[PDB]
């Protein structure tokens, strides 16, 4: 089971501001969604709430301690152990954040999707720092920048670097 970071963060690591986007990207969301499809996206309730409502084509599961939390549409999952054993038939998941729960998923992670705004905007919550010496970039491409889309970013996506032996 591949564990996956889904992130989307601006030149300071901000994810957040009062529990929203401070950007609006649409074709961000596009690449995401794309990128998702036919996998399990993981996602505390604050942010969960925040989106507002299931995103479709997806497995949607919750995570939090709150024993009594349920939505329609969604799946519930209270611990780490609680999501590998919901996802134990997956080939891959998305995590898709709140800063914790990147942590709870951090001793797991195999590949990481960051989506790097090339901007400083006001935040409270943050991708939490990460030594990419373990990583190794796979993948890169500038995003759509227009009309809609104000900023200019990047989509990029790293698997772990192996380690040759002495
Ligand atoms: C802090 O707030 C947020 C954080 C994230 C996390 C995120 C974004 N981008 C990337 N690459 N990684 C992430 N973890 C999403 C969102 C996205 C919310 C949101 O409004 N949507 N998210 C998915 C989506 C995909 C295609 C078209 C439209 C949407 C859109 C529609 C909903 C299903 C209602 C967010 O909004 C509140
Ligand atoms: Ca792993
Ligand atoms: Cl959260």
């Not at 001793?107 to 990583?135: C, Q, R, S």
């Not at 491409?141 to 227009?146: I, R």
């Amino acid at each position: 089971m591949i564990v996956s970071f889904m992130v989307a963060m601006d030149e300071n690591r901000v994810i957040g501001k009062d529990n929203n986007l401070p950007w609006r990207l649409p074709s961000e969301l596009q690449y995401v969604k794309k990128t998702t499809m036919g996998h399990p996206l993981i996602m505390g309730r604050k942010n969960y709430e925040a989106i507002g409502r299931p995103l479709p084509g997806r497995r949607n599961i919750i995570v939090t301690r709150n024993e009594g939390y349920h939505v329609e549409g969604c799946e519930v999952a209270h611990s780490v152990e609680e999501v590998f054993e919901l996802c134990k038939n997956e080939e891959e998941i998305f995590i898709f954040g709140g800063a914790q729960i990147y942590d709870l998923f951090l001793p797991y992670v195999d590949k990481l999707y960051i989506t790097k705004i090339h901007h400083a905007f006001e935040g409270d919550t943050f991708f939490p720092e990460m030594d990419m010496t373990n990583w190794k970039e796979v993948f890169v491409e500038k995003g759509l920048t227009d009309e809609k889309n104000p900023y200019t970013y990047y989509y990029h996506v790293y698997e772990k670097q192996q380690l040759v032996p002495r």
